[PDB]
Amino acid sequence: DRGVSTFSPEGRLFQVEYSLEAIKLGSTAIGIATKEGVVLGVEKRATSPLLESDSIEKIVEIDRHIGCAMSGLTADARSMIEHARTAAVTHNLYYDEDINVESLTQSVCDLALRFGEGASGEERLMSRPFGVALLIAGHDADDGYQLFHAEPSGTFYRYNAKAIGSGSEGAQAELLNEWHSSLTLKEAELLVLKILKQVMEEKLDENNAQLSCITKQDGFKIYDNEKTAELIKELKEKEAAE
Amino acid sequence: FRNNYDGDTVTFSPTGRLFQVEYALEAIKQGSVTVGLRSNTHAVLVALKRNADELSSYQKKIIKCDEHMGLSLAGLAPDARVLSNYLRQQCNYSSLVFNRKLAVERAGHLLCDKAQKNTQSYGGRPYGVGLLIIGYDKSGAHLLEFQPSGNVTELYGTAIGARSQGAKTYLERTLDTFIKIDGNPDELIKAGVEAISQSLRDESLTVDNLSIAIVGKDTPFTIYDGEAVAKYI
Amino acid sequence: MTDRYSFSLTTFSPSGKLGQIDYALTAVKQGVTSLGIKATNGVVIATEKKSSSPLAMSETLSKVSLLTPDIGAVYSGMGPDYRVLVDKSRKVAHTSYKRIYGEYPPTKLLVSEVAKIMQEATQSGGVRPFGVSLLIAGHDEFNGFSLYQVDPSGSYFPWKATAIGKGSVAAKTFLEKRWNDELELEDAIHIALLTLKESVEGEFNGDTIELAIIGDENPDLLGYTGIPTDKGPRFRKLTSQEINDRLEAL
Amino acid sequence: GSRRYDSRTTIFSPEGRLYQVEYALESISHAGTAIGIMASDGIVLAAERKVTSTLLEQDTSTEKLYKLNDKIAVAVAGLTADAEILINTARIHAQNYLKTYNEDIPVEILVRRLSDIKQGYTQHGGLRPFGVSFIYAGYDDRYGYQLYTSNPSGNYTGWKAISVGANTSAAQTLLQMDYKDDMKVDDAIELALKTLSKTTDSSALTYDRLEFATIRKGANDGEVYQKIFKPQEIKDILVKTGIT
Amino acid sequence: MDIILGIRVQDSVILASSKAVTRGISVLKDSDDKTRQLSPHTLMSFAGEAGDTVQFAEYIQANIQLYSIREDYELSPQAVSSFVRQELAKSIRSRRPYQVNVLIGGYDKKKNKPELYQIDYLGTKVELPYGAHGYSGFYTFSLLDHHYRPDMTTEEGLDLLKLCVQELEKRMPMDFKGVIVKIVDKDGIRQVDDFQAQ
Amino acid sequence: QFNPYGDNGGTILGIAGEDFAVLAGDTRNITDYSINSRYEPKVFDCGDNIVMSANGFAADGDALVKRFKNSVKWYHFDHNDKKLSINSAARNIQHLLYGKRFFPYYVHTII
Amino acid sequence: GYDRALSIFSPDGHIFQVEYALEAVKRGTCAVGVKGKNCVVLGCERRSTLKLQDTRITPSKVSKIDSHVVLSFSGLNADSRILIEKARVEAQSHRLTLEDPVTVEYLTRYVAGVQQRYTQSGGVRPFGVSTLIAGFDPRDDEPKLYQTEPSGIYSSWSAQTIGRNSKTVREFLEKNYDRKEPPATVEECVKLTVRSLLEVVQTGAKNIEITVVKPDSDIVALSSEEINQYVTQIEQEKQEQ
Amino acid sequence: AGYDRHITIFSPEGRLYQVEYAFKATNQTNINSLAVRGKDCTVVISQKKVPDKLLDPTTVSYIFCISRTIGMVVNGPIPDARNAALRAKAEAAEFRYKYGYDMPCDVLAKRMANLSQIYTQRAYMRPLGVILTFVSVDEELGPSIYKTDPAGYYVGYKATATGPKQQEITTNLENHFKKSKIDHINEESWEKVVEFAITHMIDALGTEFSKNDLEVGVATKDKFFTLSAENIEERLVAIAEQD
Amino acid sequence: GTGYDLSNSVFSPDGRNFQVEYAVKAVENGTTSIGIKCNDGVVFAVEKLITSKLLVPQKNVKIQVVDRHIGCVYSGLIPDGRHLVNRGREEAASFKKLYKTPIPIPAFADRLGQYVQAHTLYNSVRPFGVSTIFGGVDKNGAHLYMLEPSGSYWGYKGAATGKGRQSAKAELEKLVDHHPEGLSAREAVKQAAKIIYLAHEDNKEKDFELEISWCSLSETNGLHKFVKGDLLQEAIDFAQKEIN
């Protein structure tokens, strides 16, 4: 056949490029970083009405100051979150402090290219790359509120606002116009809901959509269905005005 | 022809070429441009950072290895992280065991041997990044060009990445000028900024776009970003 | 370096056939004819010494080999594959039995051990099956005289009389007509020389035919006297002169 | 490297089937027919020998019916050499249980363990599966007389009457036709021989082509006894049933 | 060492275990239950090394419960005791052995008979009508050799253990803070909460 | 039998002020009753405004200071040139010391 | 030794080995699970290709992981035993260290975690098994029902079916199960389980098995007569109209 | 299916093509070699071809000194030849250390043939494309010739031949032993046995030799040695004074 | 059929290893390098293609030293040559550790020979893309060797490999014929410069740098040293005089 870590004539890794196609099939995940906090939102996408939407866990806590959102093969993210939770706690044990968001993202991204049938370098025991993209968001005293996009390629970019999933290309173009450096936390909350509504196949409500924020004061908190429903109602009224 | 011998790095072609190595070299040409140049006192790295979106940050291109050594990347960033981390360890081993600052030439030999082992065994892939190593040791200023093939070459000036031929043609023509810039760091930076601008096509170099690093006689390896490179724009 | 052949080289085909076993059996068919006959007071195994060159010494190449003082073996197919199996069969007789029970293994269990090695060569990674069928003749106290056939698949069958190789089909038919459950050892050797004559094309003498017997104990071949229970090996390879004397009464 | 020569034994088909397992079952369908029948007072094992000769020593021959324990025995269909590998491991497992608990191993536990080893070669290792189908006949103080079967996939099921090997479809129809819940061993012996004689690919069912075993609890003993039939004992019982 | 007593009567097995945990100079606990339920009809008491005593007991408990789920069946007291013996036999020749002495008190549902097993840290199993570990037997055995009958009721067995404890509370220098008494029969395992002044 | 430990003597002193901190130590290195050196540095500047001295067995002292200075160096590489705080340094040294719990550094270290 | 990458990405972005593992589940016998107000009921169908089995000793489709958690499956029977064994060990290991029996969510997370591990490890293939995990959390009376699949994705369901003709029975449950009013009684919860299977099984008194899990480790399997009483009652509902 | 000719697995005909192609690799060097037994000696003759003038003639050799007693001549590429040479030397030293006596010629052959059988059966180790002829004067068997091939086959020889024109040398030796009726060369001195071996090399090939065209290895009691160019020259003068 | 050239250790129907012959093509594409054996030592010389004026002269050293007396030069894939020298240095250190005396040249030749030959025995390793010319002075005289990708090596009076190996071998053959008594160390260095300048005619599109090294008993005390300064310029002037 062909090696898993094989380069294409163009200069790209086959398996990594094919992994990005799997993320395109995944549910939409949007993050917006402001000076008041970083807001993360995902699409639940229930395959059946009998499926309990609250069990869908696409927003996870890494540490009190770091949150995460996933898109694509969500099962592949579980060991990545496990490593992230370990790296955050292990740093706290070694240095009696909080891990930097950039340092935490770097630790997760080091696992990405560790795949092959026996690549000469270390002991990279994995048959294939991760089929999931992560939106790592948090806060530290050094660089403040941050939003990162962790790729299966091992590369990570710091975004002011990033959208990943099925409607990622349409969402990113919308985030390009809407984002400004003076956005408030509440303005970012209605914005995540606005763009999600535009890219979701189903009508947006408190069941098929979930919000989360990370602040310096309260830390990472997942929005309950009662709190989110009021924000959907507020977003519906403001769009009805003009 | 090409389809049968490019399956893995272990396979030779009838002409004697290694296509997997050649495809890894192609990843550099797709990567962003970076320029390296030196004189007798200082060595300078000038790099053009690339962003995905206008909402994204510009990905760093220059990595510090030691107080006297550093390098700029072109291609896959994680592969540059692995090779720089190894070079950090080799510089560290020399300082701890021998109380000796590692020679830039010997550092090039170490990167050569590590890249070679990835090209002779099954299952492995070549590194998808080109590196420009600068350093000041007991023999003066140095500049070395690392290639995934293993080939490392000591140069006065060089450039790798997209449209890098324009910068390389400039440095070849300006060869006699920037070599004599001794005891003046700022003028050597300006020679590198003018070199990297010869490769520009899409946009002009801006504040959060340009990345410059320098190491010299009485100057430790320091990276300048953002406001620190505004005077060279 | 490092064996990357960790997968099976023998696999099931759509028809259910195990290709590499079938092809190994085909290699046995190309091999020189070897036979075995079990009598009431002994077992006889015989084969043709197919010399590649008249310059080569046929005495140095032994197609019939001693496994234990009571057990012998002969083959058909690939020579090199047989020789290594004999080395393994001799070692497994000690390591798995004699160093445990203080005595030599019975024929049926030694055959079982050889069959295990040949089975593993069908399932293990990075190996091909042995291109040989073995005829193992032996004696033990509780089972008496026995003859076994071991195939490349690892399957083994007890035989009264059988043949394997080039003219096995023609030899088995000849053995069925001449065999009876009242045959003496000397009679069994007489049929052995008659059955092998139909397979050999060129010269038929003691220098071109290799023959050994499993019969009575040989105190002269023991090498020492003293212990009453030790009465000597039952395996005896017949010399060139001993074969020629029986060929005159053919 | 070696990737070129890898047959990939442990992969799914587009349909969701396991190639090597399905092809192994095809190999079994050519091997000699083995039938097991469970009665109220014992179990009957009957097997048809594949490829026989006049000069084949039947008295010392064992290819289909093997003894695992004093209470558990097996009927083999497929590769004999592959079976002996599994038979040996089952013998060690039975003795491991007896050493640990000071009690004889319940039939199902021995069956599950062998089936788990078969499953191992199906999921990982890159090696070919065992081309063997077992019929387990055993007794324990929990369920009493038990009859199981296992195939190359590692799947096992409990039965009242089952056939493995060649002509199973025809053999299972005949067993389902004559079997009742209140059967006696003597009746089960007859059914097993009658089913084989009708599904035989050869001219006539004779003693030199058969292996027979019965597992019965002796009324004048109170303990379960295994009886692997001798060539003469198979010859006698073949005449009594009406086959001669 | 701690007090670990066992007696097998007509229809049940009675285990008496001391409540004291002594570490160096102080009695840290006077209500410690030195027993674990392995299965609904099998109970094991234990004494020995400070850390090994509970670690081994819970290890066996986990294994028996793993078997009970897998087979949907309860192992006989004999089968359990043989498993415990082998684990202690493997331990005795390891890097650091389990220094734990155990008493298996179980009721066989198939046999309808109570059974008591005694295994020490070495792995010495013995089926006994009555058993004790350490110095416990030195004071008790003569009373047990005298009064014990196979046809004794549960009430009679409790009276004999009371006499055994009274001898221990008189002649033995260590204060073991009384005993917890448990009954193992056909209905399962129950604890006698009124042994302090029975 | 070979004894892996030794006593190089010396004494170190660390006093924390309101907005300052001092770490003193004598420059005398000894073995039994002989003076090895009259001037042998014992208090070292490790970077990030942190000073360190590990007094006792000098070979263990030099190894610990050398390994901590290297830990500061790697803290800059891994965490984007972040300054190592005094509490973070203290916790880091604990793991450096407890890593050799069953074959300890025979030193009394103060930062 | 063997570490060949079997589960890999394709040009379109699918893992074919995981994709074909779902096809093995589609071949396996139908398994359904419904949760009421105070109970969860698991129902599985039996094959009718060969009919001469001993129902006493034949491994049942519903397996107990612990005294409070049960597991049913659809797909390869041999692969399921591996997942069942590992779940049973983890259940005992959790009781040993945490001193409290597993929650249904945790046991599901473990089983799905094992399945996911086999989708990106060299030399192994994914399990051709989807599982339905049902039960009650320790000291809790709230019904729990979960589903896993070869990929490693798990989620909780009010009602779910897996296996052959699972598309038909899912459409039945979507128009019959009410979230506003779940089956309040155990009897009506079992009734809905049989009703959903009768759409697929096509008249099978011996072909349907029912297992009911109640709070505080109360699991009981219904006999052939008990299930047949429901079948007789349901068939009367159709005939009276 | 078509990879049966790429690795050491059986073809439908029951053949091993990789082994068969390894036999074809033995004739790549285009060198003929023969071995003959004397009364108390063993002589190997091998063709010496130096095509390039830049080559050092003293290094161009296909005869190896394995032990004090055993010598080996190889037919096939020199990288595989020296691979088999180093292994044979290692086995000879180990045998003496473990068993207290010098390894016999036939035992070394059997050992090297067993190793070649492993490459015939196991997939990852390729067969060496060389034929090894071992020669010595054994303390029990006397003059000994034992030859191994890529198949793992080995047998004793009264006399042997190996190379592209092997058949011509074999039949030429065959016709002499039919005439003499004895298995060895009836001569006291080894010098005349070398002379015999050279003469029959000429008669079979139909080519005259110089001192630099041949390579001679002589095995005597407790010693094996290779002849120099001047030693062969002395031997060529003696046969020239006969014809 | 076809496909014998795709894997390494696979024999083609003609008994050839194509992957090794494909590695020879990489050597033939590479830079020309030479070796001359004189009366008491050896002289090594290599061409250094100047790709750009940006390359720092006298810095990118191609000739490598093993131990203190052996010099190595190679043609083809430069990193592959370094890997072989790294092994050679480990093998030389292993010899000196056990046997005290520095490794003899025939001894060192076999050590590299076996290592390169080992890379032709497996399908998991790639053959070396270099032909290495090496040698020095030991216990008895000087030695010169050339090692091929197959592992094949011989002793040489003069060695040549690379782009212009034909022109180099022809010029070396003239030296062997005209000097039967033996060339001197001084003359060999001057001649080594002349050989490359004439061999550069096959790659005369690009500028080149000269690099000579030598190991002589009387001139360098049997140690490997690089030709530097006045002696290097004297060689260049000798070559530039006879090029016209």
d(CA H119, CA D230): 46
Neighbours of G142 (CB within 10 A): 11
Q: Which domain holds residue B28?
A: 1-233
Query: Domain total for chain A?
Result: 1
User: Which residue out of G2, G7, G9 would a mutagenesis test of the A interface target, given it has the greatest number of A Cβ atoms within 10 Å?
Assistant: G9
Contact E69 G89 (CB under 8 A): no
Partner residue opposite H13 with nearest CB, options C26, C57, C80: C26
d(CA I59, CA I74): 17
d(CA E192, CA F17): 66
Query: Domain total for chain D?
Result: 1
Burial of B231 (0-12, 13-18, 19+ CB in 10 A): exposed
By C-alpha distance, the chain D residue nearest B124 is: D1
F77 touches chain B (CB under 8 A): yes
Q: What is the CATH number of the domain that holds C219?
A: 3.60.20.10
What is the least distance, in Å, from the CA of D7 to any CA of chain A?
Answer: 11
Phi then psi for residue I70, to 5 deg, are -105, 135
Nearest to B29 by CA among B198, B168, B162: B162
What is the least distance, in Å, from the CA of A14 to any CA of chain D?
Answer: 17
d(CA A203, CA A207): 10
The catalytic residue among I2, I31, I32, I220 is: I31
- Contact at 8 Å (CB) between E125 and E81? yes
Contact D1 I6 (CB under 8 A): no
Nearest to A66 by CA among A31, A96, A95: A31
F79 touches chain B (CB under 8 A): no
Spell out the residues 6+ positions from residue G193 whose beta carbon is closer than 8 angstroms to its own. Answer: G32, G34, G41, G42, G43, G210
Type of residue at I155: G
Q: Which domain holds residue A14?
A: 1-242
Across the strands, what pairs with H155?
H147
d(CA B13, CA D61): 57
Q: What is the CATH number of the domain that holds A67?
A: 3.60.20.10
Q: Which domain holds residue C87?
A: 1-250
Partner residue opposite A6 with nearest CB, options B25, B81, B125: B125
Contact H6 I7 (CB under 8 A): yes
What is the least distance, in Å, from the CA of A184 to any CA of chain G?
Answer: 34
Spell out the residues 6+ positions from residue B57 whose beta carbon is closer than 8 angstroms to its own. Answer: A157, A158, A159, B51
Residue by residue, what is the 3-state secondary structure of chain A? Answer: CCCCCCECCCCCEHHHHHHHHHHHCCCCEEEEECCCCEEEEEECCCCCCCECHHHCCCEEEEECCEEEEEEECHHHHHHHHHHHHHHHHHHHHHHCCCCCHHHHHHHHHCCCCCCECCCCCCCCCECCCCCEEEEEEEEECCCEEEEEEECCCCCEEEECEEEECCCHHHHHHHHHHHCCCCCCHHHHHHHHHHHHHHHCCCCCCCCCEEEEEEECCCEEEECCHHHHHHHHHHHHHHHHHC
> First vs last Cα of chain E: how many Å apart?
25
d(CA G82, CA I51): 63
Phi then psi for residue G69, to 5 deg, are -115, 135
Burial of G39 (0-12, 13-18, 19+ CB in 10 A): buried
Nearest to B31 by CA among B163, B221, B121, B124: B163
What is the least distance, in Å, from the CA of D137 to any CA of chain G?
Answer: 12
Sort residue I17 into left (φ over 0), alpha (ψ -120 to 50) or beta.
beta
Type of residue at H32: N
Looking at the domain G1-241, which fold is it?
A: Glutamine Phosphoribosylpyrophosphate, subunit 1, domain 1 (3.60.20)
- Contact at 8 Å (CB) between C44 and C137? yes
Contact H53 I176 (CB under 8 A): yes
Catalogue all structural domains in chain H, each as residue range(s) with its CATH number.
Answer: 1-243 (3.60.20.10)
d(CA C196, CA C250): 12
Type of residue at D82: D
A101-109 and A77-95 helices cross at what angle (nearest 10)? 130
CATH number of I1-244: 3.60.20.10
What is the least distance, in Å, from the CA of I87 to any CA of chain D?
Answer: 24
d(CA H168, CA H200): 10
- Contact at 8 Å (CB) between G41 and G62? no
The per-residue DSSP string of H23-40 comes to HHGGGTT---EEEEE-SS
- Whether H and A touch, i.e. at least 3 CB pairs below 8 A, reads as no
Phi then psi for residue G41, to 5 deg, are -125, 125
Nearest to A65 by CA among A97, A107, A29, A94: A97
Partner residue opposite B171 with nearest CB, options I5, I24, I54: I54
Phi then psi for residue G62, to 5 deg, are -95, 120
Q: What is the dihedral of CA E114, E118, E123, E125, to 10 degrees?
A: -60
Q: What is the CATH number of the domain that holds D192?
A: 3.60.20.10
H-helix or E-strand containing I2?
A: none
C-alpha R_g of chain I: 18
Sort residue B25 into left (φ over 0), alpha (ψ -120 to 50) or beta.
alpha
Q: What is the CATH number of the domain that holds E60?
A: 3.60.20.10
Phi then psi for residue H115, to 5 deg, are -65, -40
d(CA D231, CA C101): 31
Tokens of B53: 């979106």
Q: Which residue, chain included where needed, has tokens 């049933």?
A: D241
By C-alpha distance, the chain G residue nearest E57 is: G96
Known catalytic residue at I220 = no
Q: What is the dihedral of CA H125, H130, H135, H139, to 10 degrees?
A: 10
**Sign, Cα dihedral of I105, I107, I113, I118:** negative
Order of all β-strands in the sheet with A156-158: A59-63, A66-72, A132-140, A144-150, A156-158
DSSP E174: S
Across the strands, what pairs with H35?
H44, H160
E31 touches chain G (CB under 8 A): no
By C-alpha distance, the chain I residue nearest H29 is: I15
Nearest to B127 by CA among B113, B115, B117, B112: B115
- Contact at 8 Å (CB) between C149 and C34? no
d(CA H32, CA A63): 78
- Contact at 8 Å (CB) between H187 and H38? yes
Tokens of A222: 């997942």
Across the strands, what pairs with A13?
A7
Contact G91 E69 (CB under 8 A): yes
Total residue count of chain H as it appears in this document: 243
By C-alpha distance, the chain A residue nearest D1 is: A3
Tokens of B104: 């830039």
A120 touches chain B (CB under 8 A): yes
Residue by residue, what is the 3-state secondary structure of chain C? Answer: CCCCCCCECCCECCCCCEHHHHHHHHHHHHCCCEEEEECCCCEEEEEECCCCCCCEECCCCCCCEEEECCEEEEEEECHHHHHHHHHHHHHHHHHHHHHHHCCCCCHHHHHHHHHHHHHHHHHCECECCCCEEEEEEEEECCCEEEEEEECCCCCEEEECEEEECCCHHHHHHHHHHHCCCCCCHHHHHHHHHHHHHCCCCCCCCCCCEEEEEECCCCCCCCCCCCCCCCCCCCEEECCHHHHHHHHCCC
How is chain I split into domains, by residue range?
1-244
